[PDB]
């Protein structure tokens, strides 16, 4: 989460997402 960092379609929105760990 430090190559790209984690991305998501809101605020508090993990689990269906851009990348929870790079």
Q: Are 6 and 17 in contact (CB under 8 A)?
A: yes
Q: Is the dihedral of CA 18, 6, 11, 13 positive or negative?
A: positive
DSSP 8-state assignment for residue 21: -
- Those residues whose C-beta lies under 8 Å from the C-beta of residue 12, and which sit 6 or more positions away, are none
DSSP 8-state assignment for residue 5: P
Token pair for residue 19?
A: 């990348």
> Cα separation of 20 and 5, whole Å?
8
> Cα separation of 13 and 15, whole Å?
7
């Amino acid at each position: 989460a430090g190559t790209m960092r984690v991305t998501y379609p809101d605020g508090q929105k993990p689990g269906q997402s851009d990348v929870e760990k790079d």
